[PDB]
Amino acid sequence: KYGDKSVYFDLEDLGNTTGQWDVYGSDAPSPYNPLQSKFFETFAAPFTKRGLLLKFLILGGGSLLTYVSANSTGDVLPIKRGPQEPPKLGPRGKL
Amino acid sequence: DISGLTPCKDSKQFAKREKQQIKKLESSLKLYAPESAPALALNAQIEKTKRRFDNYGKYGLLCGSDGLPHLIVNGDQRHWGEFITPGILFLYIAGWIGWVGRSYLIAISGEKKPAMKEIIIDVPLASRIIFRGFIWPVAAYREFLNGDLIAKD
Amino acid sequence: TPPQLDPNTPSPIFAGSTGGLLRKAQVEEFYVITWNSPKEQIFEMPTGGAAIMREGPNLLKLARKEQCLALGTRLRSKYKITYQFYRVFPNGEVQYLHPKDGVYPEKANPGREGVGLNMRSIGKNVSPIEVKFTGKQSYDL
Amino acid sequence: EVKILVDRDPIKTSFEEWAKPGHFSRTIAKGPDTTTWIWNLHADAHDFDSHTSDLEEISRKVFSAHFGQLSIIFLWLSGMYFHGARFSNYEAWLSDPTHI
Amino acid sequence: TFNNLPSIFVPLVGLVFPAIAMASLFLHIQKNK
Amino acid sequence: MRDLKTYLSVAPVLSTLWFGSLAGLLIEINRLFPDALTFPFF
Amino acid sequence: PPIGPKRGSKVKILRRESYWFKNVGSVVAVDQDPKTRYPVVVRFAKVNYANISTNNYALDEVEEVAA
Amino acid sequence: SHSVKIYDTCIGCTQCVRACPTDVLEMIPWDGCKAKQIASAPRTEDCVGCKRCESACPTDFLSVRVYLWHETTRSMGLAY
Ligand code: CLA
Ligand code: CLA
Ligand code: CLA
Ligand code: CLA
Ligand code: CLA
Ligand SMILES: CC1=C(/C=C/C(C)=C/C=C/C(C)=C\C=C\C=C(C)\C=C\C=C(C)\C=C\C2=C(C)CCCC2(C)C)C(C)(C)CCC1
Ligand code: SF4
């Protein structure tokens, strides 16, 4: 009996003694409109498969990153501009 | 003239160092009255500096291109006074100390609780033992020959 | 001896602390200690704070064995009461743990056997070269 | 009520406890088995809650220790005022307290 | 396009390959046969 | 004075007395023979 | 016959794993039971790292010193 | 988990067991000492490794002897 006066070791009800309570888990039904839910369930199902989501994210993020860096003109980031200045000589002539 | 070093009584950089330090002291001597006590202390320091440089001149110190007394510790007799005559004077005194503190430790080794004489030194026993180490080298020599210097475990 | 068969006895009066059973009880073993206190009194429980154990039987569920045995030694040395704790896995199978013979382990009860016991001095252990490329170590011959 | 509440001659002034070192405890008032004894002597030197387990003796010890600390602070102040008297330019600083 | 090759490979080794290796080695770290 | 000579026999009191005497000796030697870098007395 | 050294005999230690290895000690007592493996109780002048001056030693882990 | 092996130099003083905060050790009957008891170690799986057992063993070096080994949640002193 877990609900007795200061008894907290009901052995068959070991979820209440171990602290397996859902502090905030609500079993209340779906709050969203079912048509919006159906839209998201059909349009996000392609991303459900994990082994096909990890591969997709890898080969899509790397693709977009190696692409947007390649076709980045010399206005976004200055490393692709160049010196844009006469190169100055180093110490001792150049050495 | 060993190791490419001119002597310090002949080194121009040594005399220049002397004159520089003396001018540095005199520039601090101008701010005080000539009869005042800081001025007299500065003048005493000036004579101390002058006779210090004179003594480094006369004692055979060798001065380099930087103009500072270098010590020739190799073994040349001309410079034994730089390292060996002090060095023996160290090994004597140091060997006094260790021959005393060892002997004391042997004299309080046969007590019941000999640790309460390590922290509370028997001044009579220590004063009897202290001058035993005056002529310590013959005692250490003989104890090396008699085997009393090294414990046999 | 037969174990003591942990019942649903009451617990001490405690206002709650941040030293309880977080997840080592949900998925792994947690522990429970039972002690018979002759009177109701205050005691410093090992999870931080101060609880008031009741008269007669008490029961406190703790997260690891060191809490249980620390509290037990403080009980046996300060309040002189006889403690005995268990280990309860999250599926059940409460394991009797502390005395294991009824008498405390400092007393040489017969029946308990020699396990973890080498019949040699400590420096007669062979070197690691003797037990190299073998699953055994230098202290298991 | 708040009485005076003192007692006469609780501890005998003598150098007997100056002689035996580490007198103030059980495990230090035996002598040095090792050199850790010295460190544990100085470490537990002012640990009056470890020497005697009563607040009376502890409180007397810390009270007289505060008196020793006050004697030290007064001695240090005497030193500073004296070094300002005989070993200072305090007059010359008063005459020109911006370049002296 | 040879001054553009650093822009291809520095992200692909420094951002993409570290994500690949971190993910794969985190899966290898938590695997259970 | 009994048991004061035992306290003054203790290692720190005795060490501070010995090193105060020794330091005064060295200090007064360096006053007498300042700025020494050789032993010329032979 | 009493086995081992005597209750005041000086002895040295041949135990490799001891603090007082190749160091002399004083035999306090020898347990005459022929079932105790380490009967020779020795007393040493200087403590070990555990601040302990005595340990029981075996008969073959000990050597009666000739001094 | 750990490996608390003891050796026959034990004298049966029962201090290793009275220091043990996890009941790893327990005195058993024995015939090798004046006290006629020796300290076994059945519950080695409960050993945290704190070595209070061998900080209380009054032998020349040690009789109880903790060899640190595979660390489990009981041996890593984990309440979570
Ligand atoms: C060593 C490899 C490496 C490389 C190649 C980059 C590259 C870049 N970093 Mg840096 N970064 C790195 C390591 C690296 N980082 C580390 C180790 C740290 C921690 C100190 C940082 C911290 C850091 C900060 C704090 C910031 C950057 C920013 C940037 C961007 C440059 C800013 C700019 O002018 O573009 C401007 C370009 C944009 C604003 C557009 C971004 C385009 C994104 C990246 C494309 C998305 C690709 C893909 C879907 C996601 C990745 C997939 C994955 C598999 C890699 C550029 C993409 C800046 C930035 O852009 O923030 C996002 C910025 O604020 N980085
Ligand atoms: C009102 C001030 C005050 C008072 C009354 C005390 C009183 C006490 N403290 Mg506390 N403490 C204080 C301030 C104070 N402390 C401060 C400011 C700190 C932070 C550093 C601490 C940190 C502290 C710790 C961490 C511990 C104590 C402990 C103790 C007790 C024993 C101390 C002892 O015997 O050492 C006697 C005195 C010494 C051993 C000398 C200390 C030498 C100092 C550290 C060297 C510095 C000197 C100088 C600046 C350096 C130059 C020296 C020169 C010669 C080269 C005692 C109850 C101990 C205790 O109760 O444990 C049970 C303990 O463990 N204190
Ligand atoms: C109005 C009276 C009075 C005054 C002035 C003080 C002042 C002081 N007390 Mg307090 N004290 C008082 C009443 C008073 N007490 C009472 C009634 C009690 C009992 C409840 C205590 C119990 C008490 C304790 C337990 C301790 C103090 C301590 C201290 C000193 C703290 C250090 C400080 O601030 O240095 C500032 C320094 C000075 C002002 C220099 C002091 C110089 C004069 C001569 C002494 C002050 C007058 C004093 C009460 C003696 C009266 C005459 C005497 C012959 C009877 C300080 C001097 C602490 C201390 O330092 O220990 C010594 C301490 O441990 N007092
Ligand atoms: C000369 C007079 C005298 C004599 C013979 C005694 C004798 C005694 N006192 Mg008392 N005492 C005195 C003066 C005296 N006291 C004074 C003036 C004070 C006020 C501070 C006290 C306060 C006092 C307390 C609170 C206690 C004693 C205790 C004792 C006993 C132990 C002494 C000991 O081992 O410590 C010898 C210690 C020393 C000689 C150290 C001197 C420390 C001084 C005060 C501070 C010096 C600090 C220094 C400036 C800073 C360090 C600098 C350095 C790094 C260069 C013994 C019966 C103890 C006792 O009986 O209780 C069990 C005790 O608890 N005394
Ligand atoms: C370990 C390295 C080292 C070395 C080799 C030296 C060496 C020297 N230093 Mg330097 N110094 C050092 C570390 C060192 N110092 C450190 C660490 C510091 C900072 C604390 C200093 C700070 C320092 C200063 C500030 C000064 C020196 C000075 C000196 C010189 C000492 C002159 C003197 O007074 O002795 C003279 C000899 C003695 C004091 C010994 C006398 C011993 C007694 C009387 C017994 C001897 C007689 C005996 C009975 C045997 C007789 C034989 C028979 C009849 C029985 C000397 C060249 C001084 C100097 O002149 O500058 C060059 C100087 O002003 N040093
Ligand atoms: C001359 C010279 C030199 C050189 C030299 C050499 C090289 C040497 C070597 C040497 C050696 C190679 C040595 C060895 C030794 C060894 C040993 C082994 C020893 C021992 C000893 C002892 C043991 C002692 C002790 C003691 C004493 C007596 C005192 C104090 C105390 C005591 C006890 C510590 C030079 C060049 C620098 C410079 C010039 C001069
Ligand atoms: S502490 Fe050492 S000697 Fe004592 S019972 Fe345990 S194993 Fe034996």
List CB contacts of E20: < 8 A, sequence separation 6 or more: A58, A62
Q: Per DSSP, which regions of H1-80 are E strands? A: 3-7, 26-29, 37-40, 64-67
Look up the CATH number of the domain holding residue G59.
2.30.30.50
Residue with tokens 């009056």: D48
Q: What is the helix (H) or strand (E) element at residue D21, kind and residue range?
A: none
Closest CA to G53 of B104, B115, C118, B106: B115
Residue with tokens 């002048």: G45
**Distances in whole angstroms, Cα of residue C100 to Cα of each of B92, B132, C5, D3, H19:** 71, 69, 13, 59, 18
C20: helix, strand or coil: coil
Closest CA to D37 of B66, B113, C120, A73: B113
Q: And the tokens for E9?
A: 């490979």
Q: And the tokens for C123?
A: 């420096």
H64: number of Cβ within 10 Å: 30
What's the DSSP call for residue C126? P
d(CA H51, CA C102): 26
At D13, phi and psi to the nearest 5? Answer: -65, 115
Angle, alpha carbons G3-G8-G10 (nearest 5°): 90
d(CA B40, CA B50): 15
Contacts with G52 from chain H: Cβ below 8 Å: 58
d(CA H15, CA H80): 30
E10: number of Cβ within 10 Å: 13
Query: Which residues lie across from G11 on neighbouring strands?
Result: G25, G64
DSSP for A15-51?
HHHHT---SS-------S-HHHHHHHHHHSGGGT-HH
List CB contacts of A21: < 8 A, sequence separation 6 or more: A15
Q: What is the helix (H) or strand (E) element at residue C62, kind and residue range?
A: strand C56-62
Number of domains into which chain G is organized: 1
- Contact (Cβ atoms closer than 8 angstroms) between residue C100 and residue C36: no
The end-to-end CA distance of chain F, in Å, is 46
List CB contacts of H61: < 8 A, sequence separation 6 or more: C122, C123, G17, G18, G19
d(CA G9, CA G28): 8
Say which of A5, A11, A18 has its CB closest to residue C25.
A18
Question: Which of C61, C89, C91 is the mutation pick for testing A, counting most A CBs within 10 A?
Answer: C61
d(CA C103, CA C109): 7
Q: What is the helix (H) or strand (E) element at residue B109, kind and residue range?
A: none
Query: Which residues lie across from C52 on neighbouring strands?
Result: C13, C42
Which residues surround ligand 1 with Cβ inside 6 Å?
A 58, 61-62, 64-65, 68, 76-77; E 10-11, 14-16, 19
d(CA B62, CA B68): 8
Spell out the alpha helix ranges (H) of D6-54. 16-19, 36-43, 48-51
β-strands H3-7, C117-118 pairing:
parallel
In the chain, the amino acid numbered E5 is L
List CB contacts of G7: < 8 A, sequence separation 6 or more: G27, G28, G29, G30
DSSP for G1-55?
---SS-TT-EEEE--TTSTTTT-EEEEEEE---TT-S--EEEE-SS--TTS--EE
d(CA G40, CA G53): 14
List CB contacts of A81: < 8 A, sequence separation 6 or more: A74
**Distances in whole angstroms, Cα of residue C15 to Cα of each of C11, C49, C134, D19, D94:** 12, 9, 54, 54, 67
Residue with tokens 């009054």: H58
- Contact (Cβ atoms closer than 8 angstroms) between residue H22 and residue H71: no
Question: Which of C5, C14, C26, C37 is the mutation pick for testing A, counting most A CBs within 10 A?
Answer: C26
Tell me how far the alpha carbon of residue B71 is from its chain's centroid: 14
CB spacing of H31 vs G56 below 8 angstroms: no
List CB contacts of B129: < 8 A, sequence separation 6 or more: B100, B103, B104, B107
What's the DSSP call for residue B89? H
Closest CA to H60 of B35, B65, D22, G14: G14
Asked whether at least 3 C-beta pairs link F and D within 8 Å, the reply is: yes
H55: helix, strand or coil: coil
Q: How far is the CA of D46 from the centre of ligand 2 (A)?
A: 9
Which residues surround ligand 4 with Cβ inside 6 Å?
D 11, 13-15, 17-18, 23-24, 61, 64-65, 67-68, 72
Burial class (CB in 10 A: 0-12, 13-18, 19+), B5: middle
**Pairs across C and H, CB distance < 8 A:** 109
β-strands G40-43, G24-30 pairing:
antiparallel
d(CA H40, CA D75): 63
Closest CA to B48 of F38, F28, F37, F34: F34
- Contact (Cβ atoms closer than 8 angstroms) between residue C37 and residue C45: no
Residue with tokens 């020599």: B141
Full residue range of the structural domain in which residue G16 is found: 3-67
Largest CA distance in chain C: 60
Q: And the tokens for F24?
A: 């005064």
The size of chain H, in residues, is 80
Helices B80-107 and B123-130: crossing angle, nearest 10°? 140
- Contact (Cβ atoms closer than 8 angstroms) between residue C124 and residue H61: no
Closest CA to B70 of B142, B153, B138, B8: B8
d(CA B10, CA B3): 16
Helices B80-107 and B137-146: crossing angle, nearest 10°? 60
In the chain, the amino acid numbered D89 is N
DSSP for C75-98?
IIIII---EEEEEEETTEEEEE-S
In the chain, the amino acid numbered B134 is F
CB spacing of B116 vs D33 below 8 angstroms: no
Binding site members of H for [4Fe-4S] cluster: 10, 13, 16, 20, 47, 50, 53, 57
d(CA B48, CA B50): 6
Q: Rounded to the nearest 10 degrees, how much is the dihedral formed by the CA atoms of F9, F15, F21, F22?
A: 140
